[PDB]
Amino acid sequence: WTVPTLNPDTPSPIFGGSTGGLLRKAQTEEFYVITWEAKKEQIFEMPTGGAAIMRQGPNLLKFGKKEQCLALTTQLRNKFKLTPCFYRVFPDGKVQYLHPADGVYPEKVNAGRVGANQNMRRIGQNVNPIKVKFSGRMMSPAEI
Amino acid sequence: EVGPKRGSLVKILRPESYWFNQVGKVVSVDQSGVRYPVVVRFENQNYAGVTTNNYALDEVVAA
Amino acid sequence: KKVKIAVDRNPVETSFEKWAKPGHFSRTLSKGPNTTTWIWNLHADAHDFDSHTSDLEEISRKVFSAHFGQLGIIFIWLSGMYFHGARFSNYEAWLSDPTHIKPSAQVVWPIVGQEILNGDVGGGFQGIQITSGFFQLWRASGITSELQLYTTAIGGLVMAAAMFFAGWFHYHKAAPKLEWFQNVESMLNHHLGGLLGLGSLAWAGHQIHVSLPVNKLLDAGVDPKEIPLPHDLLLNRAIMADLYPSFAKGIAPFFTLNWSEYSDFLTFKGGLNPVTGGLWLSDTAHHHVAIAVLFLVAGHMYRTNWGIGHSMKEILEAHRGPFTGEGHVGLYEILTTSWHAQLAINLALFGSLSIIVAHHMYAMPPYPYLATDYGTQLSLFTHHTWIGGFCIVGAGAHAAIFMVRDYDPTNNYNNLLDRVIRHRDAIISHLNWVCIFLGFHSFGLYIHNDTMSALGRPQDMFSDTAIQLQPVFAQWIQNTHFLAPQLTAPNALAATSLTWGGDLVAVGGKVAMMPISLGTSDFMVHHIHAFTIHVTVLILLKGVLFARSSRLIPDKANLGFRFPCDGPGRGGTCQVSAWDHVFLGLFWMYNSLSIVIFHFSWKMQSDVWGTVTASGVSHITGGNFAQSANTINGWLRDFLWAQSSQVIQSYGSALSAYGLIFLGAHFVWAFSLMFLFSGRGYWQELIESIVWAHNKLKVAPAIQPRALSITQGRAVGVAHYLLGGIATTWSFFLARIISVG
Amino acid sequence: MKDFTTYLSTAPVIATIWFTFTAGLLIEINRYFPDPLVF
Amino acid sequence: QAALYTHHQYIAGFIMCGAFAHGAIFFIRDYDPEQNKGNVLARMLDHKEALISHLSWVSLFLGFHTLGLYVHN
Amino acid sequence: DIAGLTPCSESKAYAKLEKKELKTLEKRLKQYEADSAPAVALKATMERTKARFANYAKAGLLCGNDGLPHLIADPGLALKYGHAGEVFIPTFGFLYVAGYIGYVGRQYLIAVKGEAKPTDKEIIIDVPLATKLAWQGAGWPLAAVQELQRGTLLEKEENITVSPR
Amino acid sequence: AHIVKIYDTCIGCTQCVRACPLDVLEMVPWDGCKASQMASAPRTEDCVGCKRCETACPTDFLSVRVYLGSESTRSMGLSY
Amino acid sequence: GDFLVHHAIALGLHTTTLILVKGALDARGSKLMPDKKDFGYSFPCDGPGRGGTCDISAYDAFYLAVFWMLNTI
Numbered sequence A: 001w002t003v004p005t006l007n008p009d010t011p012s013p014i015f016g017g018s019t020g021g022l023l024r025k026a027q028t029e030e031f032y033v034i035t036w037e038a039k040k041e042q043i044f045e046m047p048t049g050g051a052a053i054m055r056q057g058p059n060l061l062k063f064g065k066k067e068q069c070l071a072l073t074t075q076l077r078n079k080f081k082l083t084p085c086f087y088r089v090f091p092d093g094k095v096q097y098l099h100p101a102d103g104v105y106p107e108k109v110n111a112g113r114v115g116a117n118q119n120m121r122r123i124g125q126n127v128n129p130i131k132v133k134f135s136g137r138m139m140s141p142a143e144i
Numbered sequence B: 001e002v003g004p005k006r007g008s009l010v011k012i013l014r015p016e017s018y019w020f021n022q023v024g025k026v027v028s029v030d031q032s033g034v035r036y037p038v039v040v041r042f043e044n045q046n047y048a049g050v051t052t053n054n055y056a057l058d059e060v061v062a063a
Numbered sequence C: 001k002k003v004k005i006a007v008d009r010n011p012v013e014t015s016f017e018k019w020a021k022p023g024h025f026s027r028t029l030s031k032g033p034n035t036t037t038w039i040w041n042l043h044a045d046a047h048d049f050d051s052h053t054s055d056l057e058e059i060s061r062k063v064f065s066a067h068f069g070q071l072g073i074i075f076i077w078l079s080g081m082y083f084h085g086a087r088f089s090n091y092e093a094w095l096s097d098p099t100h101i102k103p104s105a106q107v108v109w110p111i112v113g114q115e116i117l118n119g120d121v122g123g124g125f126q127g128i129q130i131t132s133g134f135f136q137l138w139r140a141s142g143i144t145s146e147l148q149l150y151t152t153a154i155g156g157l158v159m160a161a162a163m164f165f166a167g168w169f170h171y172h173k174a175a176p177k178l179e180w181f182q183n184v185e186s187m188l189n190h191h192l193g194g195l196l197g198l199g200s201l202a203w204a205g206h207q208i209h210v211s212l213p214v215n216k217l218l219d220a221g222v223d224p225k226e227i228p229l230p231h232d233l234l235l236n237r238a239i240m241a242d243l244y245p246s247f248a249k250g251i252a253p254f255f256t257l258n259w260s261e262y263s264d265f266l267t268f269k270g271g272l273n274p275v276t277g278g279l280w281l282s283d284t285a286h287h288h289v290a291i292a293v294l295f296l297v298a299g300h301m302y303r304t305n306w307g308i309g310h311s312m313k314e315i316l317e318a319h320r321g322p323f324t325g326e327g328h329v330g331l332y333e334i335l336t337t338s339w340h341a342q343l344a345i346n347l348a349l350f351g352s353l354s355i356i357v358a359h360h361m362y363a364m365p366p367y368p369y370l371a372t373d374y375g376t377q378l379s380l381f382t383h384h385t386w387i388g389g390f391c392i393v394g395a396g397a398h399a400a401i402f403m404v405r406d407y408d409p410t411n412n413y414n415n416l417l418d419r420v421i422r423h424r425d426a427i428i429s430h431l432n433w434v435c436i437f438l439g440f441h442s443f444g445l446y447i448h449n450d451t452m453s454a455l456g457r458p459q460d461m462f463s464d465t466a467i468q469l470q471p472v473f474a475q476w477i478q479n480t481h482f483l484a485p486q487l488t489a490p491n492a493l494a495a496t497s498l499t500w501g502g503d504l505v506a507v508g509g510k511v512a513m514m515p516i517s518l519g520t521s522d523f524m525v526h527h528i529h530a531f532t533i534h535v536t537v538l539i540l541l542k543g544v545l546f547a548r549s550s551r552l553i554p555d556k557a558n559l560g561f562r563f564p565c566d567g568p569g570r571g572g573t574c575q576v577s578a579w580d581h582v583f584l585g586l587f588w589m590y591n592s593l594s595i596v597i598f599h600f601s602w603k604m605q606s607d608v609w610g611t612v613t614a615s616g617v618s619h620i621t622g623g624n625f626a627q628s629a630n631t632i633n634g635w636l637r638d639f640l641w642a643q644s645s646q647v648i649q650s651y652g653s654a655l656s657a658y659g660l661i662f663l664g665a666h667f668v669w670a671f672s673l674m675f676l677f678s679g680r681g682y683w684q685e686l687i688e689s690i691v692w693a694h695n696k697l698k699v700a701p702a703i704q705p706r707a708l709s710i711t712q713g714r715a716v717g718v719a720h721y722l723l724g725g726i727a728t729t730w731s732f733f734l735a736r737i738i739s740v741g
Numbered sequence D: 001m002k003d004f005t006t007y008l009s010t011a012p013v014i015a016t017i018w019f020t021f022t023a024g025l026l027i028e029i030n031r032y033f034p035d036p037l038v039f
Numbered sequence E: 001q002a003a004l005y006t007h008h009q010y011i012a013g014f015i016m017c018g019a020f021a022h023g024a025i026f027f028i029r030d031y032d033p034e035q036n037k038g039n040v041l042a043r044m045l046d047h048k049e050a051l052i053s054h055l056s057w058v059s060l061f062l063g064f065h066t067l068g069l070y071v072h073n
Numbered sequence F: 001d002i003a004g005l006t007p008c009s010e011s012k013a014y015a016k017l018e019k020k021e022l023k024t025l026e027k028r029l030k031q032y033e034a035d036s037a038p039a040v041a042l043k044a045t046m047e048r049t050k051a052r053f054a055n056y057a058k059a060g061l062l063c064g065n066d067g068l069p070h071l072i073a074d075p076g077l078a079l080k081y082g083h084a085g086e087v088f089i090p091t092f093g094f095l096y097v098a099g100y101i102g103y104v105g106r107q108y109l110i111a112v113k114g115e116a117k118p119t120d121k122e123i124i125i126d127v128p129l130a131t132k133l134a135w136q137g138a139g140w141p142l143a144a145v146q147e148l149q150r151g152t153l154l155e156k157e158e159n160i161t162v163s164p165r
Numbered sequence G: 001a002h003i004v005k006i007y008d009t010c011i012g013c014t015q016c017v018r019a020c021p022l023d024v025l026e027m028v029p030w031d032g033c034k035a036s037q038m039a040s041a042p043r044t045e046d047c048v049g050c051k052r053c054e055t056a057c058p059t060d061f062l063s064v065r066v067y068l069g070s071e072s073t074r075s076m077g078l079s080y
Numbered sequence H: 001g002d003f004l005v006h007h008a009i010a011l012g013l014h015t016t017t018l019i020l021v022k023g024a025l026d027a028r029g030s031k032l033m034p035d036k037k038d039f040g041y042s043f044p045c046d047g048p049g050r051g052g053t054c055d056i057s058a059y060d061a062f063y064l065a066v067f068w069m070l071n072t073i
């Protein structure tokens, strides 16, 4: 498996434009780019409002936050059975692949993944707050 | 063969459980080395609408 | 392509098997109760027909039967009003003295001391003074005896049984197919011609043959017992020819295009009747004739089974300009397949027409001795206004429901709806700005006036004496309406209403209708009304446009139309659903309509209603609206503190019940604050403690008690808030207008 | 008739009949014994 | 007299609410069940359901009777 | 007498209040005829007023300075000065009916608890069993005291769910 | 950022991962349940705190917990 | 009148005490939130799961008790 490379010269779905598009954050902080492969032309619903028409083949779109890209990904997977993927793009031109992280969707187990933020105990086995008091900052009893 | 008999009634001893100090019917006991092999089904559902849960060997007492 | 009567025979079997199985309509409730929440759900999804099944035919059939059951309930209500007027009323006595005897149609049983409510309403009767205006309506139709009202009650009961039988028959014996319901062209043709046109023509015939001669004789001084019966007037031409010479010519002038011969019962008198105070029934009869002809003409517009007529889809597709893209493409399919969209349109226009009815009824009183009954006028205006506002909020709610459930983006690519969703942010931002601008320029004037009056600077206020803001447009329109019967209405004798200008009409020493003058206070209150209407529109339109998605939650449509929140994430997503927008719109509608009814009551009691003295007309409050309505302190002292004296001292008289309700309504409203300022987590833990107490004594029910849901808590709070506030204002208005009116 | 009796045995119908009976009994008691303040 | 009595009573009400609020803060932040094992403090949480239930019964009885007598009068 | 109050049979404000009520009723009655329904209704109300005042004064109630009766809630004062009918006897009457309703409901719940589907017996009331228990609840204090003595009235601590503390 | 934790009571039903709307959770191999899978949170920097995962968890008590922490641009879900 | 208003005062005191005491005892946890002690004294909620957890923290109990204190005073 290999990490995909963002192609900026990728056709985009035919949309007339809306007011729920990108804002100054896309030029000052970061934005997201969702790409997918469509087998045929089809009218889909935009996460920011309106109905667009996805073209046959590659399709690229820009969104303000990751939630919009994952919402469109879920819509394309559950309504048209596609395989979309998205990146986070910075104003300096840096592209960072986000989902799927390993090329395999996270609902199914995949080899090579390492569990993080996992507590090898239960909720009732957590310590009292008095034991985590007077720390460097506000620490919850579940953070340890 | 380890654990309560299938179909019996046991009491839940887990304090954080919704069915603490409540009776539930045993469904199946896993034969592996899992932490919570006993499966207990209850007639009354929790706040999430669930009636089955997995408890440990020492978390259930025969009653 | 063919309009016919499609139907299915015996689809559902008439049995009581499902009556013993609660929650059978939904798959989730069919399992049975396990928690108390289920019970509430059983009542929340009862009429939610598009949630039980996805079949449009089943939903349409259920809607049809629900309509029949509703009409049966309405017929039972009307039959009850007629029966109460025929056996527990003083209508016969009120007919002999409609200016001194108070209308009453409800008696109470002598138990636990409630007999004090049976006040002396006049005419040798003891009861409760009614404000529905049924006495005036029965007098307008020519009813002169209790036997006619009793017969009408029996007919209403028969009609109720017929409506119920029709609902049962159309649901279990002959249920129409989906293609029969989708014949909107034929449906509109029939509702325009048949229903409206034939109803107006039939009422015109009754008014010409019964209301006109009976009411003319009543206004001529004839005793109600000596007036000929309606069938007597309908059987011979001598009596009608004596009362109206045009009747001596028969129906011959109608077919010979000599309608001018009928100029004795079909005129343009205008104004009001100087004897009764209401509109001339000859003008109403002519009105109904014209309305019937217009609706009958309009009923032949759409094509049904022949070539002539129109196709609404063709007209919708033919309307497309350069600034709207495709246009109305797909709107016909939207309205012919979604009941919620049609419900939204119908509820909006219906509520608007209800408010228009309230305004037109106080301005142009059509019933005899209606304007002199200030209680009936105030109650009718307030009631119709509240019904209109509620229907408008429901329209917004169903628009949001359609946007969440029945909307499909595959059929709305570049139409008007898609473009509206595309620029919804611009729409909401501009409406928000205009709401802020109106709020500042509407409330700041009152605050500035309160400050200047408190600071001892009355010359710096916004009043007639100080800086004045005269509504020049409304005054000019009033002058144009007053001068209309001389230049633009040569065939009209008087103006449409007396509120424009001219001489006032008074009946029985009480002012029936006098001209209304607008000043600075009227300008300020009108801007207040505009601001409140704009804010209510903002909340409803925001909940409709942002129902599917938003910049905060892009998959709101997946969460449904009615859901509590999306969690405490993103800083907090409390009340993001369209249901919550309807919930907030209800409060704003209550605030708006409350200010509207307060303004109506103060303006009518200050510059219109009042007694008639020798060389001068004295109003109820003395005309203090043009001097005390420009400040909040004036509204609180002169209109709320001064006018509430009647409802607080009503104890010991026939209006004491109102005072009791005035207190009870203050309770329910405050009770609402318990469900609006709290959350279900606290109540769930408290219920857990109570459950422990029950478990200790082995009295814990099998059905686990669960606190009300978040959405249920909001609905309960808004329901109690609306009921408490509306009942408070109802008691205050009724007690005051009955004591001094 | 079994289904009809089961429907009449539901919580709202039983509550309506019971409250009507209790209210009627209290009303008739106050009717035949007007203004009872003490025993 | 009126202003002084009302001022002190409202201040006392706010201070009482603060006392109970800080008690809750003590239970969440500074309570140690292992150090307070079997004492009166642990026994308070041992039968808290009974306390809340009896307080609910007293409040319900007082509310129903006071409101009923007022509405009757 | 008790707390500076005087009996209603010897209070001037009580008689003045009765005369005020009869005066306003008679004033309202003077506007009607003699053989009409409102006149008969007003005369019936006046007779009810006279009977109510006579019965209240006959009962030995204690009136205040406002002419209205007062209730004695202290058991000692009520049983010592003949005021047990105000607040004592109705207290025991409510206790009997309250425990009656509570015991009937408790018996119905415990009876339907051992069945297959108790929730159905809760939403759909079993009229025969409920009627039998309603008729059998007349001995509720005896049954409750016998239950308390046997130790079967309460549930043990280990069989009740509690919070994780 | 918010603190997302997975406890040992996780049965590996993968319902919490599907309910996550910002791709924070995932499934890793494990040996403590029959499914031999366990939920993981390696991208907590994108979590907003909607608690949809807690709603989708069927264990009693929950196996996945969300604790509101320091708010940022990604945590507040701001498009500006 | 003094007797009745005193009963109203007792109702206000008992209800305010009920809300405050219940919030202080349920601050460390209950059946709805077995780990409320790990979330601190003040937090928004536990989300819409488990039927809804609006105003579940002890801070919210104090919040609802302030209204009863104002009403009692």
Ligand code: CLA
Residues within 6 Å of the ligand: C063, C064, C067, C068, C071, C180, C181, C183, C184, C186, C187, C190, C191, C193, C194, C195
């Ligand atoms: C001239 C023909 C005619 C007339 C008078 C009506 C009248 C009415 N229709 Mg209808 N309709 C018609 C043709 C007609 N329709 C056709 C051709 C179609 C098929 C395209 C439909 C399909 C239709 C639907 C789907 C619905 C209605 C509904 C209604 C009622 C609306 C309630 C109301 O506010 O009005 C005022 C109320 C009254 C005046 C009450 C008095 C009712 C009297 C008896 C008038 C009934 C006349 C009607 C033709 C029935 C007579 C036929 C006979 C077999 C009994 C109303 C009574 C709604 C409904 O179902 O209500 C139950 C509704 O949902 N209609």
Ligand code: CLA
Residues within 6 Å of the ligand: C201, C202, C204, C205, C206, C208, C233, C234, C235, C236, C237, C240, C246, C247, C249, C250, C251, C254, C289
């Ligand atoms: C829908 C409204 C309506 C109705 C029902 C009527 C009805 C009537 N109008 Mg009228 N009218 C109306 C509107 C209406 N009008 C309006 C809007 C105006 C203003 C333009 C007038 C102005 C007007 C005038 C000036 C006069 C009437 C008159 C009449 C009466 C006689 C009609 C006539 O001249 O012979 C018309 C003939 C027919 C209608 C035929 C009747 C068909 C019958 C019912 C058939 C029955 C057959 C059946 C199978 C028999 C078998 C039964 C079995 C048991 C054996 C009649 C009862 C006259 C009158 O009352 O004299 C005082 C009269 O002079 N009207």
Ligand code: CLA
Residues within 6 Å of the ligand: C043, C044, C045, C046, C047, C048, C049, C343, C347, C390, C391, C392, C393, C394, C395, C397, C401, C561, C562, C579, C582, C583, C586, C719
């Ligand atoms: C032509 C009128 C009309 C029709 C046909 C409908 C139809 C529908 N509405 Mg709707 N609505 C309307 C008007 C209408 N509405 C108006 C005027 C409003 C503004 C208040 C609303 C606001 C509204 C909301 C917010 C919602 C609906 C919903 C629904 C759907 C489910 C049915 C339901 O409400 O559950 C069952 C009905 C009830 C449980 C009745 C409630 C009884 C109320 C609370 C009592 C009213 C107090 C009473 C007047 C005073 C009594 C005094 C007391 C002492 C006894 C259904 C298709 C729901 C939905 O979309 O489904 C998903 C939804 O959430 N409606």
Ligand code: CLA
Residues within 6 Å of the ligand: C440, C441, C442, C443, C444, C445, C447, C448, C451, C452, C460
């Ligand atoms: C929002 C409603 C409102 C309005 C319309 C006014 C209006 C007025 N107040 Mg008042 N006031 C208000 C609210 C309001 N007040 C409230 C709520 C309070 C209580 C806190 C007060 C307390 C108060 C006091 C104590 C006093 C006033 C006074 C005044 C008068 C002079 C103020 C002034 O000169 O400032 C200057 C205003 C400006 C510099 C800006 C004016 C706004 C411009 C015209 C809008 C421009 C936008 C334009 C359309 C953009 C075009 C776009 C592009 C194409 C160019 C004035 C007529 C004084 C007075 O009594 O007069 C006798 C004074 O003593 N007010």
Ligand code: CLA
Residues within 6 Å of the ligand: E014, E015, E016, E017, E018, E019, E021, E025, H041, H042, H059, H062
């Ligand atoms: C000796 C008295 C005393 C002391 C030392 C403390 C100390 C503390 N309290 Mg506390 N409390 C007290 C009394 C006291 N309280 C009382 C009487 C109440 C009842 C009102 C409360 C209720 C309370 C709650 C609910 C909470 C605390 C919390 C806290 C802790 C930190 C929060 C803080 O104070 O930040 C700073 C405080 C503020 C910024 C005050 C907020 C601003 C207020 C609302 C001002 C509004 C007044 C308004 C502007 C008036 C002008 C009107 C005019 C313009 C018209 C802190 C250790 C918090 C805590 O423990 O953290 C977990 C916590 O949640 N207290």
Ligand code: CLA
Residues within 6 Å of the ligand: C667, C670, C671, C672, C673, C674, C677, C678, C686, E056, E059, E060, E061, E062, E063, E064, E067, H011, H015, H018, H019, H064, H065, H067, H068
């Ligand atoms: C006028 C407003 C109002 C009212 C009446 C109440 C009433 C109540 N509150 Mg509440 N509260 C309010 C406002 C109000 N609150 C506000 C604004 C807040 C801040 C959010 C709170 C926060 C709050 C909390 C946090 C708590 C309460 C609690 C309680 C209950 C206390 C127990 C009691 O006194 O028994 C008396 C019972 C009553 C007064 C109920 C009224 C009786 C009705 C009128 C009789 C029914 C009428 C008739 C028979 C049927 C009509 C219905 C019809 C449709 C058929 C009580 C029901 C406490 C509690 O739950 O106690 C266990 C609790 O913990 N309140």
Ligand code: CLA
Residues within 6 Å of the ligand: F074, F075, F076, F077, F078, F080
């Ligand atoms: C619910 C709380 C309550 C309260 C606040 C009171 C309050 C009172 N009770 Mg009492 N009482 C109660 C419950 C209550 N009672 C109950 C449940 C019973 C049933 C067992 C009694 C039965 C009772 C009797 C028999 C008497 C009082 C009496 C009194 C009054 C003075 C005696 C005293 O304070 O000691 C507390 C009362 C007791 C411990 C009960 C025993 C009586 C003691 C020993 C006082 C007797 C000595 C003597 C007669 C006092 C009178 C001195 C002087 C005036 C002659 C006093 C106002 C006395 C009274 O004033 O007579 C009219 C009286 O004799 N009560």
Ligand SMILES: CC1=C(/C=C/C(C)=C/C=C\C(C)=C\C=C\C=C(C)\C=C\C=C(C)\C=C\C2=C(C)CCCC2(C)C)C(C)(C)CCC1
Residues within 6 Å of the ligand: E019, E020, E022, E023, E024, E026, H024
């Ligand atoms: C008769 C009389 C007398 C006596 C008196 C007495 C003995 C009393 C009292 C008293 C009391 C007895 C009082 C009280 C008070 C109390 C209060 C006001 C409360 C509360 C609060 C609290 C208790 C808190 C707690 C807490 C928590 C919650 C947690 C932990 C910590 C803390 C502690 C904070 C004499 C002879 C001398 C004189 C004359 C009169």
Ligand code: SF4
Residues within 6 Å of the ligand: G006, G009, G010, G011, G012, G013, G014, G015, G016, G017, G038, G039, G056, G057, G058, G059, G062, G063, G064
């Ligand atoms: S929903 Fe809960 S039990 Fe299931 S995989 Fe996620 S954390 Fe584990």
Ligand code: SF4
Residues within 6 Å of the ligand: C569, G004, G019, G020, G021, G022, G023, G024, G025, G046, G047, G048, G049, G050, G051, G052, G053, G054, G066
């Ligand atoms: S709180 Fe929401 S975004 Fe965060 S891990 Fe859970 S489901 Fe995902």
Ligand code: SF4
Residues within 6 Å of the ligand: C564, C565, C566, C567, C568, C569, C572, C573, C574, C575, C679, C710, H044, H045, H046, H047, H048, H052, H053, H054, H055
């Ligand atoms: S407080 Fe209630 S409504 Fe608001 S986010 Fe939390 S659970 Fe949802």
